[PDB]
Structures are given as structure tokens and as C-alpha cells.
Design an enzyme around this catalytic site. Sequence first.
Site, PDB file in Angstrom:
ATOM      1  N   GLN A 186     -36.465  11.665  31.219  1.00  0.00           N
ATOM      2  CA  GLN A 186     -37.368  11.436  30.056  1.00  0.00           C
ATOM      3  C   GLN A 186     -38.643  12.290  30.146  1.00  0.00           C
ATOM      4  O   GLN A 186     -39.304  12.444  29.100  1.00  0.00           O
ATOM      5  CB  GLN A 186     -37.703   9.950  29.932  1.00  0.00           C
ATOM      6  N   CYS A 228     -32.535   0.749  33.729  1.00  0.00           N
ATOM      7  CA  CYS A 228     -34.016   0.654  33.825  1.00  0.00           C
ATOM      8  C   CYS A 228     -34.391  -0.102  32.537  1.00  0.00           C
ATOM      9  O   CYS A 228     -33.677  -1.033  32.162  1.00  0.00           O
ATOM     10  CB  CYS A 228     -34.579   2.046  34.102  1.00  0.00           C
ATOM     11  N   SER A 229     -35.449   0.303  31.834  1.00  0.00           N
ATOM     12  CA  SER A 229     -35.825  -0.333  30.542  1.00  0.00           C
ATOM     13  C   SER A 229     -34.915   0.173  29.412  1.00  0.00           C
ATOM     14  O   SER A 229     -34.327  -0.697  28.664  1.00  0.00           O
ATOM     15  CB  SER A 229     -37.286  -0.156  30.188  1.00  0.00           C
ATOM     16  N   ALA A 230     -34.812   1.506  29.273  1.00  0.00           N
ATOM     17  CA  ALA A 230     -33.974   2.132  28.204  1.00  0.00           C
ATOM     18  C   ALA A 230     -32.602   2.568  28.747  1.00  0.00           C
ATOM     19  O   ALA A 230     -31.653   2.787  27.941  1.00  0.00           O
ATOM     20  CB  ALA A 230     -34.722   3.305  27.612  1.00  0.00           C
ATOM     21  N   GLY A 231     -32.484   2.753  30.053  1.00  0.00           N
ATOM     22  CA  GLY A 231     -31.235   3.285  30.646  1.00  0.00           C
ATOM     23  C   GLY A 231     -31.122   4.796  30.442  1.00  0.00           C
ATOM     24  O   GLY A 231     -29.994   5.253  30.348  1.00  0.00           O
ATOM     25  N   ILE A 232     -32.227   5.549  30.458  1.00  0.00           N
ATOM     26  CA  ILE A 232     -32.108   7.027  30.301  1.00  0.00           C
ATOM     27  C   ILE A 232     -32.963   7.778  31.302  1.00  0.00           C
ATOM     28  O   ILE A 232     -32.544   8.893  31.665  1.00  0.00           O
ATOM     29  CB  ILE A 232     -32.388   7.461  28.840  1.00  0.00           C
ATOM     30  N   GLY A 233     -34.142   7.276  31.661  1.00  0.00           N
ATOM     31  CA  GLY A 233     -35.108   8.007  32.494  1.00  0.00           C
ATOM     32  C   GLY A 233     -34.827   7.845  33.960  1.00  0.00           C
ATOM     33  O   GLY A 233     -34.178   8.708  34.571  1.00  0.00           O
ATOM     34  N   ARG A 234     -35.287   6.729  34.529  1.00  0.00           N
ATOM     35  CA  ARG A 234     -35.067   6.370  35.956  1.00  0.00           C
ATOM     36  C   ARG A 234     -33.554   6.344  36.241  1.00  0.00           C
ATOM     37  O   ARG A 234     -33.140   6.863  37.296  1.00  0.00           O
ATOM     38  CB  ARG A 234     -35.776   5.045  36.259  1.00  0.00           C
ATOM     39  N   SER A 235     -32.762   5.781  35.323  1.00  0.00           N
ATOM     40  CA  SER A 235     -31.293   5.676  35.435  1.00  0.00           C
ATOM     41  C   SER A 235     -30.674   7.094  35.509  1.00  0.00           C
ATOM     42  O   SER A 235     -29.729   7.332  36.274  1.00  0.00           O
ATOM     43  CB  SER A 235     -30.772   4.927  34.241  1.00  0.00           C
ATOM     44  N   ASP A 239     -42.229   3.099  35.236  1.00  0.00           N
ATOM     45  CA  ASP A 239     -41.664   3.629  33.963  1.00  0.00           C
ATOM     46  C   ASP A 239     -42.348   4.958  33.625  1.00  0.00           C
ATOM     47  O   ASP A 239     -43.583   5.040  33.771  1.00  0.00           O
ATOM     48  CB  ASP A 239     -41.813   2.640  32.803  1.00  0.00           C
TER      49      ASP A 239
HETATM   50  O1  LIG Z   1     -36.609   5.360  32.317  1.00  0.00           O
HETATM   51  C1  LIG Z   1     -37.750   5.787  32.256  1.00  0.00           C
HETATM   52  O2  LIG Z   1     -38.524   6.038  33.192  1.00  0.00           O
HETATM   53  C2  LIG Z   1     -38.347   6.088  30.755  1.00  0.00           C
HETATM   54  O3  LIG Z   1     -37.418   5.769  29.710  1.00  0.00           O
HETATM   55  C3  LIG Z   1     -37.815   5.088  28.602  1.00  0.00           C
HETATM   56  C4  LIG Z   1     -38.488   3.858  28.657  1.00  0.00           C
HETATM   57  C5  LIG Z   1     -38.870   3.177  27.526  1.00  0.00           C
HETATM   58  C6  LIG Z   1     -38.595   3.675  26.265  1.00  0.00           C
HETATM   59  C7  LIG Z   1     -37.925   4.877  26.176  1.00  0.00           C
HETATM   60 CL1  LIG Z   1     -37.543   5.558  24.547  1.00  0.00          CL
HETATM   61  C8  LIG Z   1     -37.543   5.554  27.305  1.00  0.00           C
END
Ligand SMILES: O=C(O)COc1cccc(Cl)c1
Length: 297
Positions: free
Chosen positions: A261, A214-221, A180
Site C-alpha cells: 500500500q 490485516c485491516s484491508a488484506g492488501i498492505g501488511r498481508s 497500519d
Molecule cells: O495493510 C496496510 O498496512 C494498509 O492497508 C489498508 C488499510 C486500510 C484501508 C486501506 Cl484502503 C488499506
Amino acid sequence: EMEKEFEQIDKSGSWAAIYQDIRHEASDFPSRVAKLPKNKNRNRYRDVSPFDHSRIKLHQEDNDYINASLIKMEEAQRSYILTQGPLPNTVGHFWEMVWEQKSRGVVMLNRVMEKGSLKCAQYWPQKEEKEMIFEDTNLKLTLISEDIKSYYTVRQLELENLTTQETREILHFHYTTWPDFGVPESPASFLNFLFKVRESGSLSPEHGPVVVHCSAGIGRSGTFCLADTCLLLMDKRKDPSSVDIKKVLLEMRKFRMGLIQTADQLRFSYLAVIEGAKFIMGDSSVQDQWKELSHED
Ligand SMILES: O=C(O)COc1cccc(Cl)c1
């Protein structure tokens, strides 16, 4: 050419600066449905919401909300659903979405536990003989088979609509060594994984959109669909210099906030695309070298 832009930014150490310009140019659309009080327990993170215009709607009269966005890349002819890691109370909603959107593949880029905290609910079965029943959405999920490589795992799943007795085969692609707010070991094992998803048919227009989380669906995704879309555009035009990764990322950010991210995820995306271009430009053997370097055996 991005490879030259890559050296300029690296030598000048400007990644944090490029990254902030992207943050400042990024779209901002309303996310009113995400913020309704009845939906607070459907969101993993208070600050990561789907825009209303691109949100996936569940086909259920009670409450249609899931934290999921459709990313439509018109020129590349590729769609993706980006979603958060399901919560204990949204695992049923997750599989309902997979069913309703006619998805063939789920791409998971996180472990259930990272940094000693839970990042995702265990939303698929761990053994063939212990299937999962989601009572709220009337679906059954069975593990058919599991293929383990060193740093990822491919699962064949059977999803059954208990209401109609229809079944579908879902492929679960689980990248198991990506931290992450971090970046994969090398472009090599990430590209090997992306080519395995492509080979499965899961990204093809004869299926619904792939589900990526992933966890939020924005970074790794974000990194996954940015590399795939850039490689397809480059393919489509056989011109690496025609591809501006910053412009593609901003187009993707019209559909879901926050994609990529950190500045290191942005540098990693450039590296993945630059290395991927070897294949796209007609060196087939490079794919076999990725498999070697990834040490998946
Ligand atoms: O996808 C990733 O690597 C990071 O993305 C996040 C993980 C946890 C929380 C939030 Cl706000 C973003």
C-alpha cells in the site's frame, strides 16, 4: 541482483517512483459481485474489493460472498487466501471459509485497535472456558492454548462443525507490533515470525491455503506473501539474482488489487527478502540471530 537495485533506488531516493510504476502496470479486473447492493455490509472498505475471477466463494445458497481472494503462485507451488479483518456481521463467514478451504493457519498482522479505531472484530475466544458459537454458520470455536512472545502470539484453536461434529485444529499466528500503513521494527522479527508460520506446516501443500489478513488484506498481508513467495523461488533456483520482486508483486496483483500500500512497504519487502536470502543460501545460524535481535524472550 536485488541488493544492488536496492542501493541504486535508496541512494537515488526513487522508492515513490518505482512504487508508482507498479501502480500503473497493475492489473484491473472486474469486481461486480463485491459491488452488488446486497453485499455492501460485507465489505469493510468501499475501495478494496476482490476480483470476481479469484474471489473465494462460501458454500451457502443464500449469498456466497466474502471479501477474500485466492492468490495462486504456480511456480512457487504456494497458495494464500488474503482477506479483510472480519466485521461483526462476517465473523461466521470468516470461520465458514476457514472450514470449507481446509486451512490449517490464520495469519493476523494487525491489532484489534490501532490509532484509536477498531480495525477488526474480536473473532476468536480470549479464554479456554468461554468458547464462541457462530449461529449463522453452525461452527464452534474453543481456545486450546496461547503462547505469548514479546511482539507475536501463537494460539491453538479447535474448530467444530456443529452439523457433522467434525473438529480441526487451527493455528492462529498473531503479529502484535506492526502498524497500519507502516513496516515492522526490523526485517529480523518479521522473518522470525514468517519462519514460525512455515515450521507449523500451515503453508504446506497437504493443507488448504493459509488465511492472511490485516485491516484491508492488501498492505501488511501483501508484504507477508511477497516475502514468503520470493524466498521460496530463490530457494527453488538457489539464485538470488533470478528473483525480480517487482515481477512477483505484479503477478500477485493479478489476484488481488492494491497488494503493498506504500513505498515504505515496498522497501521493507526488499529488505526482508535480502536478509532472508542469508538462510536460503545455506547459513542456518542466521535464523538463531533473528530470534536474538527480535527479543521474542
Ligand atoms: O495493510 C496496510 O498496512 C494498509 O492497508 C489498508 C488499510 C486500510 C484501508 C486501506 Cl484502503 C488499506
